[PDB]
Amino acid sequence: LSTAILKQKNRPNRLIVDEAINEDNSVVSLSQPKMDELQLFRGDTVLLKGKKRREAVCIVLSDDTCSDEKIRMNRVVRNNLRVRLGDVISIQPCPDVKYGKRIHVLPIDDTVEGITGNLFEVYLKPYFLEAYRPIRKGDIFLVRGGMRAVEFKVVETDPSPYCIVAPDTVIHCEGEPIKREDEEESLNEVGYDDIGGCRKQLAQIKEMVELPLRHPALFKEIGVKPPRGILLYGPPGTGKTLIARAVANETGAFFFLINGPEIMSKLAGESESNLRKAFEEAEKNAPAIIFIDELDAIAPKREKTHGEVERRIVSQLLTLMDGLKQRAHVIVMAATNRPNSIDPALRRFGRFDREVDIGIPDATGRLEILQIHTKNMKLADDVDLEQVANETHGHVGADLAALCSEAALQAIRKKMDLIDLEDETIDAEVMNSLAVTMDDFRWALSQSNPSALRETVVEVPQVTWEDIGGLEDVKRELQELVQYPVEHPDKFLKFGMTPSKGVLFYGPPGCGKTLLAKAIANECQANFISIKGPELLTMWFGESEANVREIFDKARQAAPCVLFFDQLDSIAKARGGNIGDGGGAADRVINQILTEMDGMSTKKNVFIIGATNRPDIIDPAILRPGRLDQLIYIPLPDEKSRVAILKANLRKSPVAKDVDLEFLAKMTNGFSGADLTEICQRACKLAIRESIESEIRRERERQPVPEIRRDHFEEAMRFARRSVSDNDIRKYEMFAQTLQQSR
Amino acid sequence: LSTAILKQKNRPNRLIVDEAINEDNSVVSLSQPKMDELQLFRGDTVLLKGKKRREAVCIVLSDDTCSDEKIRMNRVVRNNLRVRLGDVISIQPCPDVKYGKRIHVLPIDDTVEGITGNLFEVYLKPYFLEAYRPIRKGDIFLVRGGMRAVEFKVVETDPSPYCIVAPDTVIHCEGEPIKREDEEESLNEVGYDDIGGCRKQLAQIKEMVELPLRHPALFKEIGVKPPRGILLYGPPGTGKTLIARAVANETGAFFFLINGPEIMSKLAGESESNLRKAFEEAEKNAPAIIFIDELDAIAPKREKTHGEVERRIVSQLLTLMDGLKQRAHVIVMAATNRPNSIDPALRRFGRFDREVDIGIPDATGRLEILQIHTKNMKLADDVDLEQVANETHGHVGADLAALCSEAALQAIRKKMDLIDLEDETIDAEVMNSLAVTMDDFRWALSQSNPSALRETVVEVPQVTWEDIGGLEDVKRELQELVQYPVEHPDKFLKFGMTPSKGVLFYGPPGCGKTLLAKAIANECQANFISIKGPELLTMWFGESEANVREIFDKARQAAPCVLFFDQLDSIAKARGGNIGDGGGAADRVINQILTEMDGMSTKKNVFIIGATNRPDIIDPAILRPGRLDQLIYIPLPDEKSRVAILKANLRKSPVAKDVDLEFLAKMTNGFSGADLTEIC
Ligand SMILES: Nc1ncnc2c1ncn2[C@@H]1O[C@H](COP(=O)(O)OP(=O)(O)OP(=O)(O)O)[C@@H](O)[C@H]1O
Ligand SMILES: Nc1ncnc2c1ncn2[C@@H]1O[C@H](COP(=O)(O)OP(=O)(O)OP(=O)(O)O)[C@@H](O)[C@H]1O
């Protein structure tokens, strides 16, 4: 119930926005029982409160067809109130609305292009002649007249912001034409409703910022001071500065914006004075909100700062934050991608004391974000955004916006066959037939990738489970560990049993350890991170473990995720394996991997997979419970599995019907999966050699091979060798025997 | 569908540029049926649109010999329209072209060298007398008369930009003469047609940079904002800066350049101030393009950056791209060859959201690059660019340009002994005779090596397959090893199986393991990286693995490449044999080689070949198929080989007829090939 502040509550003034029947730009209608409930009289002026602090004046009337909870209200004041159909607005009477003296209204530039008539007599005089229409400073109204309808913007009113347009009120239209860009930017201004997937964080921010500034007495009587510093921290793209934009657009208090690097100045000491002057500018316009974007830019650790001016700036900020209690009416926010780099003194109680964590949205959060970004988008009927939000597993809101933009560009590509770039104009019918479909979202989802992982992505060959032969039980387990919590989250969480956070693959080389990982990457609907072992190591001190920390943190945001540590022999070898280990850089890397895997334990599933080649050198601390709990032995295929391996490799290759894949398996008593592949590649190469010789033979006399035959496999069989010998197999069993005895 | 934007849809306005017959500078010729198709009347003034947003005005005159798909025009308008014979331009009516009031023309300096008379009366007044010539600002036209034909530049007109030179129109030529260098630079300006091998990338960049600018209504209708950030990445020489230059040249929007290190300044807060001033200037002149060249110079990782000024620069860039005050129709482009070094915050959407990879071109793309680079050059008829493109395997566009320059330099060299360095002038006959032959491409190609490989280059003693005696079967496996996947990639795909890309040579010393590698380096048509074993290893903790990674990454960039390990038992030994071996780095290097050879990445045409004296210490993982899958045993020569080895050594050696090499093979039984050479 921490979101009770978000709940819009029941107010009699609340009404639903609906299409108008006869309502013009200055009159609205309410139902007669609602008029009697609100004590609203016909002919009274009423005020409508919408989103983004947008307000308008209209006359209230009675309509017997109007629902009680609903209002009849036309589109001009819809755009004025910045609301759409279905929205909830507030209505109250406004007394003491006097006759207007002078108003300055100016047309919209694109609504008057090519128009040279007398604007007053054609447009303003007939519309306001003896109508007594109520207006507001900044109102937009559409007037019919001349050869094309014209919209105007009110620029000045006398008095302001409310007055009555009387027949003797001075109305003039001279002035510079208002550009469309300003009106469009004001219309597309961001509000709270733009924000999705962070309702809890939105409630926290509102009750930390808006409620104290709006009602300081409500806190005063109970005797608790408002929170003076709020820190918004999270991974890039989550919507921190979007929250800042929403607050700045829909708060009552004056808003001051500070960008960290902007504080810097060349003159000696002027940067601290700039921070100071910003704070006193907040002082004069109290109450106020200060937003310090990129706080880590100007607030590093003073223990680690090598510059005098930066250290002075941090200390000056600390002094200002300490005095912020003396201010009593100023609230400061800060957004940072790395909260850990900020000096801890700025995180002490009384300085950024309450920290809000803007996190990765869930499935319903991603659905909300997608719906928000598709509100201006035009969609067909086949589109279902719930599936799209389901398929985006680790995507942050910025990634979802990128997905929507890519899908729109894909629809534009689909229409690019008809549209011509070099054309001076675009046809109307082609423009109208343009629309976004499910196929565009599916293409975008194909090309979609979280921005956090673009540095860990690798191009993996196309591998599907049918490509892998044998290991049928192993395949089921891998789907039973990965696919069930991904597809059935409710089952696992309800039971409450602790999961295995690892599956170590130990087996002879070429038996499918890496292919199973490729199958996970291509099929399983979870973000995949492939870590080649010795990538994380760095010769420079401290960074080698840092790369381990960031990678483990990197998979943390994108849960569901699979962290594939290929060849654990390098990063995680036995403690004391380097008996000297004077530097300890390898040892500290092994310890760091231990810290992270034990460090995180929560509902969101992050699977760590290691495809070790020879598992005995691995530190057993990795294999001990709590880390890599489940182990799968990837064995050499038997006679039945080998036939599947031969079929899976040869399924895309045209082969003779005479070739018996069952016969080849029993001859290959001990061959691995890779060895069976070499038999097929060797046979394929021999067929190519014949085809090259055949085509040379035919062209030589003038101046082939449709499929691999039985003789081709016969010639390729003699070159075949058994890669992994019997002695190598025993050690792989020996590791299992030692673990089984301990188990 | 990806390159749908690059389709040049056929419209009647699209016409082929053709030579002139009797036309002067101010007219072009169209076929009568095509005129009736577009309702064009003879004598009408029309507006011509060409490359690089270049416009010209010409009069339409009918010709029965003019093709319906072609338009006749002279050299002057073609140089005005920045097009060539065989290009496509758009022709449309240009009404309301008024009579000129007063125009300013300035002659070209090199056409007036030695002319001291009144340029007006000598050239211009006869040129425009009762002609009503249509002219446009910036046009270049040549006038005959006097002592030498003189070109003129129209720098200003009244009205603008189109007017007709009427008899009363004032034509004055006073002013500062125009430099030749400026005209040359403008004529050799770089456009979208100068970039080859990047059709997908050009499609993406045109969709991002050109399409929203030219049609800012499609996105308004569909209700989205097109991506406003492009990050071009790839190995050096692929053309990222070239694509930036083409975009700057061919766009109408204001274009601002930001070189990386130019931002840095002495005084505190001047780097942030410079970035802010650039972005504010772009915002004022919206729509605009900002190009940040060498972005990794000023945008490194904040967590990996020591100096606080650099982190402040990164934060300022982050706030400028996306902050509380969003950008106003500004597109930001950047080019780096290390996209991973860029800070992770810059890569998300609302920033460098679209990352476009300028990869190494394949055969057809590099043929396109060669055609682009040879359009200005003059070549003999015997040349074949297709063969030159086929032979250049790992070359990048810069390397192809270097090949062209080297070939032209060889063409100059061939004509050197005729001409003199200290002579005042070159013989005109030598200049006319001068041309680039196929021999010059062949020589430049022989000396041509990729830029990526200018470090891993060694001198090889030029061994041929005939130098190696015996090993007849092994040679056939080696020749078809590298030839088949590159010469016939279709055959593998038709049979649908991956080629084998690994060979291990093991045998007694002196039997030709290193010799076979020498022959591969010369005879085989693929890049060759030869590295001895221990050279990769380094004192530092992570360097020894990073060295292995960059060699394999370098071989991938140069595919098809052969990566030969001279003593593979050095760098690839059995793990666990020595506990505490060094810092454990030797075992980790084996792991690095293991993942690079066969891992989760897609495998290119990189053939890994290794030779080892003692293969028993080789790590069994390295021997697994998919890594050195073929284990070739090169044993001591039999009697038949011992004859061949003796003959191969002495093939260039004058020997007596009486000595019988056949007997020598029978006496030696366990002799190695090195031992046989010792006798010789
Ligand atoms: N929860 C959300 N709901 C709706 N839109 C969102 C949400 N989160 C992000 N976006 C959108 O995705 C983009 C995120 O950019 P923005 O700069 O606001 O994110 P940020 O995480 O605060 O940034 P940074 O980490 O760089 O400070 C914007 O286009 C924003 O509108
Ligand atoms: N079950 C299988 N079905 C089909 N192909 C297989 C199978 N097992 C192995 N292969 C083949 O072997 C190769 C896969 O080797 P992989 O990298 O998975 O081996 P590994 O057991 O992880 O060994 P290592 O990492 O020690 O070399 C591919 O060429 C693949 O075609």
Ligand SMILES: Nc1ncnc2c1ncn2[C@@H]1O[C@H](COP(=O)(O)OP(=O)(O)OP(=O)(O)O)[C@@H](O)[C@H]1O
């Ligand atoms: N695709 C291409 N088409 C035509 N010419 C090309 C192409 N790529 C490179 N070139 C040629 O190579 C040079 C372009 O170098 P450029 O500065 O664009 O490379 P780059 O990839 O940006 O390099 P770096 O990353 O080192 O800055 C020019 O001489 C140009 O003619």
Ligand SMILES: Nc1ncnc2c1ncn2[C@@H]1O[C@H](COP(=O)(O)OP(=O)(O)OP(=O)(O)O)[C@@H](O)[C@H]1O
């Ligand atoms: N088959 C051969 N034909 C001709 N010369 C040969 C042959 N085998 C060896 N030689 C001669 O042996 C000498 C060096 O041989 P090479 O370097 O190829 O041996 P290797 O087997 O690779 O040795 P190592 O593994 O010990 O480095 C050269 O003089 C070369 O001419």
Ligand SMILES: [Mg+2]
């Ligand atoms: Mg932000």
Ligand SMILES: [Mg+2]
């Ligand atoms: Mg593997």
Ligand SMILES: [Mg+2]
């Ligand atoms: Mg460059």
Ligand SMILES: [Mg+2]
């Ligand atoms: Mg050797």
